Curated annotation (Swiss-Prot), chain A:
GO terms for molecular function: structural constituent of ribosome. Present with 15900 molecules/cell in log phase SD medium. Gene3D superfamilies: 3.10.290.70, Ribosomal protein S8e, subdomain. This is Small ribosomal subunit protein eS8A. The modification Phosphothreonine is found at T61, T106. GO terms for cellular component: 90S preribosome; cytosol; cytosolic small ribosomal subunit. Keywords: Cytoplasm, Phosphoprotein, Ribonucleoprotein, Ribosomal protein. Belongs to the eukaryotic ribosomal protein eS8 family. CDD domains: Ribosomal_S8e_like. Residues 1-30 are annotated as: Disordered.
Curated annotation (Swiss-Prot), chain B:
The gene is RPS9A. It is found in: Cytoplasm; Nucleus, Nucleolus. Signal peptide: none annotated. Component of the ribosome, a large ribonucleoprotein complex responsible for the synthesis of proteins in the cell. The small ribosomal subunit (SSU) binds messenger RNAs (mRNAs) and translates the encoded message by selecting cognate aminoacyl-transfer RNA (tRNA) molecules. The large subunit (LSU) contains the ribosomal catalytic site termed the peptidyl transferase center (PTC), which catalyzes the formation of peptide bonds, thereby polymerizing the amino acids delivered by tRNAs into a polypeptide chain. Component of the small ribosomal subunit (SSU). Mature yeast ribosomes consist of a small (40S) and a large (60S) subunit. The 40S small subunit contains 1 molecule of ribosomal RNA (18S rRNA) and 33 different proteins (encoded by 57 genes). The large 60S subunit contains 3 rRNA molecules (25S, 5.8S and 5S rRNA) and 46 different proteins (encoded by 81 genes). Interacts with snoRNA U3. uS11 interacts with MPP10. Component of the ribosomal small subunit (SSU) processome composed of at least 40 protein subunits and snoRNA U3. This is Small ribosomal subunit protein uS4A. Belongs to the universal ribosomal protein uS4 family.
UniProtKB/Swiss-Prot annotation, chain C:
Component of the ribosome, a large ribonucleoprotein complex responsible for the synthesis of proteins in the cell. The small ribosomal subunit (SSU) binds messenger RNAs (mRNAs) and translates the encoded message by selecting cognate aminoacyl-transfer RNA (tRNA) molecules. The large subunit (LSU) contains the ribosomal catalytic site termed the peptidyl transferase center (PTC), which catalyzes the formation of peptide bonds, thereby polymerizing the amino acids delivered by tRNAs into a polypeptide chain. CDD domains: Ribosomal_uS17. One of its GO terms (biological process) is translation. This is Small ribosomal subunit protein uS17A. There are 2 genes for uS17 in yeast. GO terms for cellular component: 90S preribosome; cytosol; cytosolic small ribosomal subunit.
Curated annotation (Swiss-Prot), chain D:
The modification Phosphoserine is found at S31, S246. It is found in: Cytoplasm. The keyword rRNA-binding applies. This is Small ribosomal subunit protein eS4A. One of its GO terms (biological process) is translation. It comes from Saccharomyces cerevisiae (strain ATCC 204508 / S288c). Present with 573 molecules/cell in log phase SD medium. There are 2 genes for eS4 in yeast. Residues 41-104 form the S4 RNA-binding domain.
RNA sequence: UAUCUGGUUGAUCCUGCCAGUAGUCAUAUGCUUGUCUCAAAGAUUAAGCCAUGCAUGUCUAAGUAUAAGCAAUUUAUACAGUGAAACUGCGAAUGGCUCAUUAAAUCAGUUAUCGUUUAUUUGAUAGUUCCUUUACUACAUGGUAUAACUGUGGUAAUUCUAGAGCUAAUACAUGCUUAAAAUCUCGACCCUUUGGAAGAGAUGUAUUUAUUAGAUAAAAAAUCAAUGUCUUCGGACUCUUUGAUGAUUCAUAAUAACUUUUCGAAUCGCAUGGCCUUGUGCUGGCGAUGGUUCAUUCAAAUUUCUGCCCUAUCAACUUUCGAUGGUAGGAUAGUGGCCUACCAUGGUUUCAACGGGUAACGGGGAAUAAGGGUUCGAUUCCGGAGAGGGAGCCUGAGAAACGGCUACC
RNA sequence: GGUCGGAUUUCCAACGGGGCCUUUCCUUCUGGCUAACCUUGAGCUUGGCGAACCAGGACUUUUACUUUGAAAAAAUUAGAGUGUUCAAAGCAGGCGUAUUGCUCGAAUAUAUUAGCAUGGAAUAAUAGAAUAGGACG
RNA sequence: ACCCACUCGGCACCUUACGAGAAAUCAAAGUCUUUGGGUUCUGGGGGGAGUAUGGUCGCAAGGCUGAAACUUAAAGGAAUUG
RNA sequence: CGCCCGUCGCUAGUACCGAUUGAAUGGCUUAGUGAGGCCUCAGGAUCUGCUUAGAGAAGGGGGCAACUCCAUCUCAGAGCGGAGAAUUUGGACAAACUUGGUCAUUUAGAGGAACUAAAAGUCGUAACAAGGUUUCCGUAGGUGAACCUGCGGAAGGAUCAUU
């Protein structure tokens, strides 16, 4: 099986180590997950000590946080558009960590309307008072406004689905948002 | 696996074997004290030598 | 050292959420930590725009265990160097010693500016790489 | 070797049990428990080689199974349970209560005591932490884990316990000038009345310690064991009280008690 | 117990070696051998091949028993005694054998896990499980085999197995049943606008993500975005609370969601105890079993400094296709070139790298001695490796298992 | 000898140790201890300069060396005691009023280098402020 | 250019033998069993053998490095008398 | 009449060179084939829960007469699903084999050239005295053999000596 040690590697001087042990179970590795989109499939594997490990596959939907609002909603995923590690993962649309994807943006939109009563893109006394108090925060910024206009919003995957069965992440904002859209636009 | 029983002798052979003086003296001793074995004689001399080494390396000390 | 976000990824300190909505003083935030044992987190690390997560101060890499001192001899690597531990192994039979050296490599932050000959002490941290275990905490030259 | 050990030879078993290098080439392995392997006394070696109340492990299992015995207020019907440091054992037969403490000769003594001196014990705090749901707790040197103690109770302190519950009768903090007991090193069994200490921040907090003959020494702060305050011990102490007289002084002692 | 002797010469002094001499838990052999006690023993050559037979199975009071097994319940109509076989649960990863491998590798001392798993024991630990949450649902408790067995049997042979009929569970798949408050939302409604509002859903545990708190060198001043506490609405403003750590994004707590859904006892033996609202009502003990989390203990894996025999008739070595580092990601139980994508081109070297050899596993130790030392150390204890050579993997907490499977030789 | 060959005093002296001054700061700021308190109340009173306890801010140029300690698994080795009938061994044994029973033991030493702390500062090197980016300021 | 005296550095010399060494002999071949100022290079009985091989240099002749098997009790140094 | 050198000749041994594209053994290994498991794309025998599903027509309840209500053995047919082996794509792991290369460890061998040893072998007599041409060192040549000769060097020389 896939080893995880350096008794099969070279020393630092340039010296082939000798053959010392047989491969183990506590120095092993396993194949990547290569998590994809559509028709959620999660095979599980038994690990060292029970200690289950949800090998993600074909994951269609995931969770995404907006930290300026402190909220965290469930959403589908349009597809990945950029990965620093490999344009191949970008092309083949394989979800991993640090992964730049597009999501529906509709739950965030409708929540914004329900919470502030302030439009995006383009009543009762209690809710009116609520929105009047929650005002001065419907001014997020131009790029997110455009992305809510488009209905496809840029998020970063921060989970490890092949280890967790969970595509979780957060919407991009401001600095890294500008950095990554610049990377996309680089032509 | 059973820890092995210690064994250690109680004698020591002569350094140099054939010295007529040594042999006749220890023969006198054997023939007066009724002994059979230079083994026994060496054994007693070895005990004496052990205690004498102790005496030396003790009176060396303050 | 022209650009902190030189690489394709977005290098930063994790979890340090600089809220773009509030516009407060010190536009960007920075975590840090006193390493302990009488060490100092330098002001270049405090004011630094850099990231270098493998640093003990701004990063998340606890120093703990053995400590060593040596002189730097290499600088040709990226946030990593090699030192020389000149010491003397004793021989009881001949009752006298012999020079030996072991060139351990260490990790270095942007918090230090190191030229060759700068004597330096480090701290045992976790395995930074195949070759490395230690990280520099004080320099002793100019 | 591919998994946990199960056996134990003699001569890997510790010294202070005084197990003999003859009599079969295998030894009683202390099964896991609230105490370590080495600073622990199995009940088999206890009953079979301290009292001679039995001769063979078969007899000892008969005893443990008929339940004349009980540790921590519980029967503890295992032949190789770790009777560790300070611990209490109560025997209906003879209405005895033996306590497990050390002697200066580096051995687990046999301290005959009464039922109330059994009904309380001592325990060194090993650490303190905050459990889930905001329940502060601590854990002792005998695997006992206890909740909602005084915040004044901090690390290296010692507690005196009810033995019907794991709750506290009282506690004693660590500071300069308190009576202690030693566990580890050449000083196994000493009682030496803390005089001062030293930090060396980074490892090995050390303590300078001397018993009432002015005789001083130095020990590790995790090997010491604080038993209360200077003068009064919270328990009764064995022959010697941790003194370590000379070979010749002890020779003269026994020659007076010929 | 810091010891010498014979031998080159016709003789002498010397160098210089030889032989002699003493010992060995160092072996073999020879010749001989009456006794007591202790005891090594197919390592050296072949880690060469192996017939035959054993070497790990296992139950209580207490998981499942109608053995068409055996005693007798007669205190028991369901058994309730014992009890093969079988299901189940544990363990079979320890022991034991050998030393082939292996020369910075194991190992020995010495550090760390602020970088991780951990059955088992031991100490603590699951009011929150009705999910259109009102009929959607037994909780004095729910569903399913299936074995054993009955018999049909099939191969020359196998711890070979099919076919048909039963039946059990701590085996499987499921499953409700106990407080109180407290914030959010809504939000009926009043409408007020200083703005007041009934009523409704949530909150246990666990996983994953994002966010906040998790602290605290020193004292006054100017206001307000709007006075905020209560008002003399002149403003008095205090009150404030946070543990450990050498040091943490630590322990730990809360907001918002995620979960294909984790745990929250349908188990078992004894003893039968108390209230009367006189109901098989309600409550009750000593236990065993298992069970989420944390800690502990026996472990385990990685890890810091130092240290290894002979060789230069081995001086350049490493990097194609990982060698040195870095970023991102994957995998791992976990860090990390462990692996990949991309990138800089570095890294070790006469202070002997690298390569070769080793009748080399290492150490604790053994013989031997004035000291210094030399030699040996497979070999009873410690750590490693292996099961005919290699590779792989299932089960499991734990194996790369070999008295377990798959293949090749 | 004040004990009948034990132990004490002024002890003259030596021996090594701690401290002050001799141009000899041999880190100081915050603190509480304010300490040693100049603080004195009549002969035992009310108030001195922070390490002597401690938390820190602080300069802490580098080593080798050397001392002490913790620690270094047992067995082994040396070695205490011990009548396995002696002995090799082993760690047992011994004593009773032998009915209740009593009772010392299973020491101690060694443990290389390397690693931690550690008093020292001789010895050996070791940078220091010179077309002063020099310290006190 | 000579003489005298002195001086530093050189090639060496005469005598002693305190000292050394196995002896011849030696102003170092001394200040070494009362064993240590600093450093380099080489030898470990005689032969085999400065052979064989492998590298390496040279046109070559040959050189530098350079073993083993096997054999043997002596070879050898300095002096004495014959 | 001492000691002694070498060739040649006999006997025995040890190692070396050596054609033999020598032979074996083991290790590392390019390339190629590449099993076998494991993961992933599908697969779908098979079993199986739910939802209806209409009727061949029994039973009883009701217009008691056609007719009507529901259960019923029945069988399609339909979806809603659960598990699902054989087989299967691709991937990493990668035994073994073939072939070369390479590294070391032993080994056969016609013959050739050496060395050593061995009571009395032949040829001479090079060496030790000025050894009968003083010896030796290096180099070159010569010849049956020791060995000779030339060029330079030394004294271990047969001289420490010519004012």
């Amino acid at each position: 099986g896939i080893s995880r040690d350096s008794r099969h590697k070279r020393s630092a001087t340039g010296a082939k180590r000798a053959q010392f042990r047989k491969k183990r179970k506590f120095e092993l590795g396993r194949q990547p997950a290569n998590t994809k989109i559509g028709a959620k499939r999660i095979h599980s594997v038994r690990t060292r000590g029970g200690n289950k490990k949800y090998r993600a596959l074909r994951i269609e939907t995931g969770n995404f946080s907006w930290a300026s609002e402190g909220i965290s909603k469930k959403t589908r995923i349009a597809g990945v558009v950029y990965h620093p590690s490999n344009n191949e993962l970008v092309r083949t649309n394989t979800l991993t960590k640090a992964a730049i994807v597009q999501i529906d943006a509709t739950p965030f939109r409708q929540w914004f309307e329900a919470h502030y009563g302030q439009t995006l893109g383009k009543k009762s006394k209690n809710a009116e008072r609520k929105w009047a108090a929650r005002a001065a925060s419907a001014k997020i910024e131009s790029s997110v406004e455009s992305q809510f206009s488009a209905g496809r919003l840029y998020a970063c995957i921060s989970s490890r689905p092949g280890q967790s069965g969970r595509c979780d992440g957060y919407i991009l904002e401001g600095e890294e948002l500008a950095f990554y859209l610049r990377r996309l636009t680089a032509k | 696996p059973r820890a092995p029983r210690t064994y250690s002798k109680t004698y020591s052979t002569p350094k140099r074997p054939y010295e007529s003086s040594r042999l006749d003296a220890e023969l006198k001793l054997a023939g007066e004290f009724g002994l059979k074995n230079k083994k026994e004689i060496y054994r007693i001399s070895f005990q004496l030598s052990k205690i004498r080494r102790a005496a030396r390396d003790l009176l060396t000390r303050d | 050292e022209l650009t902190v976000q030189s690489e394709r990824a977005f290098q930063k300190q994790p979890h340090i959420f600089n809220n773009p909505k509030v516009k407060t003083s010190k536009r960007t935030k920075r975590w840090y930590k006193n390493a302990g044992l009488g060490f100092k987190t330098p002001k270049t690390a405090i004011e630094g725009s850099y990231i270098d997560k493998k640093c003990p101060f701004t990063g998340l890499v606890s120093i703990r265990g053995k400590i060593l001192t040596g002189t730097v001899v290499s600088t040709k690597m990226h946030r990593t160097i090699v030192i020389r531990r000149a010491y003397l192994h004793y021989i009881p039979k001949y009752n006298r010693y012999e020079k030996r050296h072991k060139n351990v490599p260490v990790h270095v932050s942007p918090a230090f500016r190191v030229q060759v000959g700068d004597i330096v002490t480090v701290g045992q941290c976790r395995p930074i790489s195949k070759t490395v275990r230690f990280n520099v905490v004080k320099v002793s030259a100019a | 070797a591919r998994g946990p050990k199960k056996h134990l030879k003699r001569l890997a078993a510790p010294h202070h049990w005084l197990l003999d290098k003859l009599s079969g080439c295998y030894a009683p392995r202390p099964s896991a428990g609230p105490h370590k392997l080495r600073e622990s006394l199995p009940l088999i070696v206890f009953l079979r080689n301290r009292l001679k109340y039995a001769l063979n492990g078969r007899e000892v299992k008969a005893i443990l199974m008929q339940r004349h015995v009980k540790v921590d207020g519980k029967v503890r019907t295992d032949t190789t349970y770790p009777a560790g440091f300070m611990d209490v054992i109560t025997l209906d037969a003879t209405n005895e209560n033996f306590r497990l403490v050390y002697d200066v000769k580096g051995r687990f003594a046999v301290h005959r005591i009464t039922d109330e001196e059994a009904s309380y014990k001592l325990g060194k705090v090993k650490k303190v932490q905050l459990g889930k749901k905001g329940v502060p707790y601590v854990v002792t040197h005998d695997g006992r884990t206890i909740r909602y103690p005084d915040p004044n109770i901090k690390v290296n302190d010692t507690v005196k316990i009810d033995l019907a519950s794991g709750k506290i009768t009282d506690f004693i903090k660590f500071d300069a000038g308190k009576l202690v007991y030693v566990t580890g090193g050449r000083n196994l069994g000493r009682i030496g009345t803390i005089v001062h200490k030293e930090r060396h921040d980074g490892g090995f907090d050390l303590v300078h310690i001397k018993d009432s003959l002015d005789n001083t020494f130095v020990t590790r702060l995790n090997n010491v064991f604080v038993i209360g305050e200077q003068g009064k011990p919270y328990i009764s102490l064995p022959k010697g009280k941790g003194i370590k007289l000379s070979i010749a002084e002890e020779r003269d002692r026994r020659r007076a008690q010929q």
